A paper describes a structure:
Of the known factors that promote muscle development, TRIM32 is an intriguing candidate for coordinating metabolism with cell growth. This protein is a member of the Tripartite motif (TRIM)-containing family of proteins defined by an N-terminal RING domain, one or two B-boxes, a coiled-coil domain, and a variable C-terminal region. In TRIM32, six Ncl-1, HT2A, Lin-41 (NHL) repeats comprise the C-terminus and are proposed to mediate the diverse functions of TRIM32, including cell proliferation, neuronal differentiation, muscle physiology and regeneration, and tumorigenesis. A single mutation in the B-box region of TRIM32 causes the multisystemic disorder Bardet-Biedl syndrome (BBS), while multiple mutations that cluster in the NHL domains result in the muscle disorders Limb-girdle muscular dystrophy type 2H (LGMD2H) and Sarcotubular Myopathy (STM). Our data show that TRIM32 promotes glucose metabolism through the stabilization of glycolytic enzyme levels.
Residue numbers in the entry: 1062 to 1353
């Protein structure tokens, strides 16, 4: 991989390499998938929301394992949306309709849960959307509280930031986030049609994009990912596009349109980026994950 020019790789993005899913509840099928994440060896981890489960695939698409079932018990999920994998390989699920986070081990066995519905510190309204920083700190978007709450690996509350509003440092219904290896917190601020970037302590660092349909503009951004150089990847759901941004925030590339064939989307949700430049998009109403 030594001579790779990332910018050139990203600018060639359009044609799907392969896809995953198809409607159903058997292993390898999805129902209305929302969050996805990449794992250690570039594994593809899918929040299979309406099947109340996570499914894990290797970097070439081969199904590996699934875990979870409907419920409010330990290791059960109501209608999960967000998923993530930390450096230790344990699975971190935003169990949306139970208003809690569950952390499972690399084999999908239950380790701990935390949170319940509420506005208070450590309490969530509709969690939807989670990620991990290098030290194992958990960052949640509780969508309906218009904020980001950060926890320790054991669930201990640590801090929070953002609040309802349309201004500097505010959020309206944020769905998805990512933390870069620079420890900048990258929040898709859905209804403000913008990407918000904070440091770990809640200080606004910059803003990417704004409302519109031109290059560099968003209509209801959903999934976000960041690569190891700071390229930012956005599911521009309102405009039926993936957008890619240079590490300085400037528009680089866009691809996709409303549809259900190769490179077409309906209901863009989560987004993830493999360390080889493969972009992963969750295509909710087509019950599939597409890889570019």
């Amino acid at each position: 991989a030594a001579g790779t020019i990332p910018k050139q790789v990203y600018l060639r993005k359009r044609q799907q390499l392969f896809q995953l899913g198809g409607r159903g509840s058997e292993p390898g099928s999805f129902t209305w998938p929302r969050g996805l994440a990449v794992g250690p060896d570039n594994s593809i981890v899918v929040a299979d929301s309406s099947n109340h489960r996570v499914q894990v695939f290797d970097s070439n698409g081969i199904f590996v394992k699934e875990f979870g079932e409907y419920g409010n018990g330990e290791g059960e999920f109501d209608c999960l949306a967000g998923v993530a994998v930390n450096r230790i390989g344990q699975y971190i699920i935003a169990d949306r309709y139970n208003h809690r986070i569950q952390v499972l081990d690399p084999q999908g066995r239950f380790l701990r849960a935390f949170g319940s519905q509420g506005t208070a510190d450590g309490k969530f309204n509709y969690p939807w959307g989670v990620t991990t920083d290098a030290l194992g700190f958990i960052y949640v978007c509780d969508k309906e509280n218009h904020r980001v709450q950060v926890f320790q690996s054991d669930g201990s509350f640590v801090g929070k930031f953002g609040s309802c509003g349309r201004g500097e440092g505010q959020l309206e219904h944020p769905h998805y986030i990512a933390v870069s290896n620079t420890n900048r917190v990258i929040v898709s601020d859905s209804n403000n049609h913008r990407i918000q970037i904070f440091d770990v302590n809640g200080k606004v660092l910059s803003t990417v994009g704004g409302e519109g349909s031109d290059d560099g503009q968003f209509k209801f951004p959903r999934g976000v990912a960041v690569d190891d150089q700071g390229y930012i990847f956005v599911a521009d759901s309102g405009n039926n596009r993936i957008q890619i941004f240079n590490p300085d925030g400037s528009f680089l590339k866009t691809f996709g349109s409303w549809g259900s064939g190769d490179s077409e989307f309906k209901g863009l949700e989560g987004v993830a980026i493999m360390s080889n430049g493969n972009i992963l998009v969750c295509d909710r109403e087509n019950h599939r994950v597409q890889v570019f």
